Structure 1
Amino acid sequence: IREFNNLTKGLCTINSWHIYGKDNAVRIGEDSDVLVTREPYVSCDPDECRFYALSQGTTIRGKHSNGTIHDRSQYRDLISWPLSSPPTVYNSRVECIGWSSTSCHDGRARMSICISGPNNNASAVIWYNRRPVTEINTWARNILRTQESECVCQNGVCPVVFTDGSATGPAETRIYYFKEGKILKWEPLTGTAKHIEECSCYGEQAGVTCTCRDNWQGSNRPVIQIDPVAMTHTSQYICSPVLTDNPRPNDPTVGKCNDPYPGNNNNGVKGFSYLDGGNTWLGRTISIASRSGYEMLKVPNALTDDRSKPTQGQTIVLNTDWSGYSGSFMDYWAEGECYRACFYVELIRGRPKEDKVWWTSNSIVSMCSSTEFLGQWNWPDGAKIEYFL
């Protein structure tokens, strides 16, 4: 738009989910110059929506594809390309260089943030309107990381959640507030949340909600609500017995809102949730131990209730298929009375579980919500690891 954006509306009634995008990248990738990527997400300009992902700088067939299990390297690049196309060498747009990133449009231009580095000397540069504007350096010197979803903006202020520190210990999280690439304020994590990683954020009614990952002790996600108007936040865990991190212990009958729910430690997988009272939907992998299957379950008042069990569901990826990271996105410039709620699921293929190939990679599925109660299908990446041999 020619003007900043204010999150004036609220969510619409989630009643089922409809397919929004499917890139089919590994399937096509067996014969085109599709790029090896991982950690995808989706973000909308006022004018178009694109798929964003962290490239590994090689084609899946190319011989340099071997060994892409490694998360960070200096051949990683944050790219974007059209909605539902593959990340193709000949049409991805490189957004900045690094191995962690967030990106989001404030209404006028967009901010992209790519962290790069040695694990003890990492540095973020905050690009705004395709130009490098600001740069922040490592405060705790052990892997500076950020979202791997899109950030939400309000009146020019876009809060962004950064964690430097240990993924096995206390880390040192901090909410930063950008307006037009400059740092308005930054404040330390606060609330009962014990450790924050890979936050998934959606905005409604001038408040932004993030649903993250506690790597350390959590099997129940930390929720951070941020107030972009006053530049304040708080964190807590989701009260529901319906545990959504992966791995996890099997769901209790009573859950935990002010501490990690004890069971699977030093591990997790990025995720999201739409937190809205009666209209709360949580996403989770089906396997208690592996990223296979993805489902969306309606768990009313999940955030606040230590007894909330589901009341409606939908299957996105079967348990016999692989899934991965997921996060929230919305089209803030979509004409409506309300905000359509969307999510994406990353579909990992390769190493370590399909180690007959030496590359890891992924495709994407994304859904948005419908108020109709539509029928469900289940959406496989689709490639046969045997044709790459």
Structure 2
Amino acid sequence: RDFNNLTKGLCTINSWHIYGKDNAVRIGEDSDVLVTREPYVSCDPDECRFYALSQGTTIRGKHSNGTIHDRSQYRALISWPLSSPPTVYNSRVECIGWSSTSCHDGKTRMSICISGPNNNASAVIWYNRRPVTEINTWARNILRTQESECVCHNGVCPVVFTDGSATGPAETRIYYFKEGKILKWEPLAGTAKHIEECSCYGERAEITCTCRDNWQGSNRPVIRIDPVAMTHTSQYICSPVLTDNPRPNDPTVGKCNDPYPGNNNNGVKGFSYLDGVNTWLGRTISIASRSGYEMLKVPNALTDDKSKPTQGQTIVLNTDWSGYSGSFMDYWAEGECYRACFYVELIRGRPKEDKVWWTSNSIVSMCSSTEFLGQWDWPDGAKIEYFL
């Protein structure tokens, strides 16, 4: 109809209720489910769907051998109905590639897929299910993007990309697209020293992205974008409640403009809702691996370097595998506010479970409630032994 505009603020998050879960690996043990990773959730005005990067093979198929690898010519961004698994028969390919993002602007959807060898990748921007724009690698070192949904405001849908090293300074750019065409792009600015896989959401005409400093920081870099002025700033979450993984143990004081040191060259896609006292951070429970998952209310996390949790909710037990996590919201729901939501990728297989030769995942997602709901834990649920 008309372009959606971020006119509401966030609903108060007092707890998280279950939204979707596909139990993909469980079901896929005996049905035609595609091997995936790097999933996310994204809504259209009339439907919300699961998204992920297929590996071009089923979990039980012999070609599932080797799916731990990230970039091949057999990957593609696919979407399928909420809470269903990604099967060969219900998955809709949005585009071909090994890195992506996607978002609906109110009129139609923009999907971006990047493909290519490490030194010659290229992004192709799709709008209304048609290829419209292409961007060639600028640093010739794995051009890559969010791996979660982008956000639009009056037709402008900014997207963060990084090209260059993952263990040293790199070339991050913020592209502002409208109808799949480039309106403008900026280099990254602010104090964030390295950006990877930004998780974004929008409220009151401002887009907030919590990303991953793969180089030095265990605290998360944040990129706040103004989609009208088409400008942005960058810093880190000030809070000592560190949310990357692997990471050191929490200090009593965090860092606002530098990576918090302790772990180099590694991390995990993650997210947060930074909204004054209505601030919640997601993180793996384990400081060593992608194990477990919890949400912690840390009032003023973004700007208070001594902020510690005041409430929390466990999502996945530390005795269960987790993985990537990102934000999305249904900007077309009824009501006066935007209900924050997120998904957690539950990785199964390699490298942690090497008795199988594949790597895949299932998805669990939650959204906020103004009630103070009881909590449950949501594991993947598959028994690796069955796949042997």
TM range (shorter): over 0.9
1:6: Cα distance to partner? 0.3
1:147: Cα distance to partner? 0.2
SS at match of 2:356: coil
1:279: Cα distance to partner? 0.5
Q: Please state which structure has a larger fraction of its residues in strand.
A: 1
1:8: Cα distance to partner? 0.2
1:278: Cα distance to partner? 0.3
**In 1, Cα distance between the equivalents of 2:89 and 2:222?**
39
1:386: Cα distance to partner? 0.3
1:173: Cα distance to partner? 0.2
CA deviation vs aligned residue, 1:85-123 (integer Å, no higher than 9, x gap): 000001100000000000000000100000000000000
CA deviation vs aligned residue, 1:255-286 (integer Å, no higher than 9, x gap): 00010001000000000000000010000000
SS at match of 2:277: helix
SS at match of 1:321: strand
**In 1, Cα distance between the equivalents of 2:194 and 2:379?**
32
1:255 paired residue number: 254
CA deviation vs aligned residue, 1:149-176 (integer Å, no higher than 9, x gap): 0000000000000000100111100000
**In 2, Cα distance between the equivalents of 1:126 and 1:325?**
23
SS at match of 2:63: helix
**In 2, Cα distance between the equivalents of 1:232 and 1:77?**
31
**In 2, Cα distance between the equivalents of 1:30 and 1:254?**
46
**In 2, Cα distance between the equivalents of 1:39 and 1:182?**
25
SS at match of 2:56: strand
SS at match of 1:173: strand
1:246: Cα distance to partner? 0.1
1:144: Cα distance to partner? 0.1
TM (norm. structure 2) is 1.00
**In 1, Cα distance between the equivalents of 2:79 and 2:116?**
21
SS at match of 2:331: coil
2:122 paired residue number: 123
1:365: Cα distance to partner? 0.3
1:194: Cα distance to partner? 0.2
1:348: Cα distance to partner? 0.1
**In 1, Cα distance between the equivalents of 2:357 and 2:103?**
33
1:26: Cα distance to partner? 0.2
1:296: Cα distance to partner? 0.2
Mapping of 1:69-84 within 5 angstroms? 69-84=68-83
**In 2, Cα distance between the equivalents of 1:62 and 1:8?**
47
1:300: Cα distance to partner? 0.2
**In 2, Cα distance between the equivalents of 1:355 and 1:328?**
30
1:319: Cα distance to partner? 0.2
SS at match of 2:27: helix
Q: How many matched pairs?
A: 388
SS at match of 2:135: strand
Mapping of 1:1-389 within 5 angstroms? 2-389=1-388
1:317: Cα distance to partner? 0.1
CA deviation vs aligned residue, 1:66-102 (integer Å, no higher than 9, x gap): 0001000000010000000000001100000000000
CA deviation vs aligned residue, 1:208-243 (integer Å, no higher than 9, x gap): 000000000010000000000000000000100000
1:125: Cα distance to partner? 0.4
1:35: Cα distance to partner? 0.3
CA deviation vs aligned residue, 1:174-229 (integer Å, no higher than 9, x gap): 00000000000000000000000000000000000000000000100000000000
CA deviation vs aligned residue, 1:49-69 (integer Å, no higher than 9, x gap): 000000000000000000001
1:253: Cα distance to partner? 0.2
SS at match of 1:64: helix
CA deviation vs aligned residue, 1:281-333 (integer Å, no higher than 9, x gap): 00000000000100000000000001000000000000000000000000000
**In 1, Cα distance between the equivalents of 2:277 and 2:206?**
18
Among all aligned residue pairs of Structure 1 and Structure 2, give the percentage whose two residues are the same amino acid.
97
SS at match of 2:161: strand
Gaps of 5+ in 1: none
SS at match of 1:36: coil
**In 1, Cα distance between the equivalents of 2:313 and 2:284?**
12
SS at match of 1:38: coil
**In 2, Cα distance between the equivalents of 1:229 and 1:207?**
9
**In 1, Cα distance between the equivalents of 2:193 and 2:247?**
17
SS at match of 1:194: coil
**In 2, Cα distance between the equivalents of 1:60 and 1:129?**
31
Gaps of 5+ in 2: none
**In 2, Cα distance between the equivalents of 1:246 and 1:168?**
15
**In 2, Cα distance between the equivalents of 1:268 and 1:353?**
16
**In 2, Cα distance between the equivalents of 1:352 and 1:299?**
32
SS at match of 2:39: strand
SS at match of 2:186: strand
Runs of 4+ in 1 over 6 A off after TM superposition: none
1:383: Cα distance to partner? 0.4
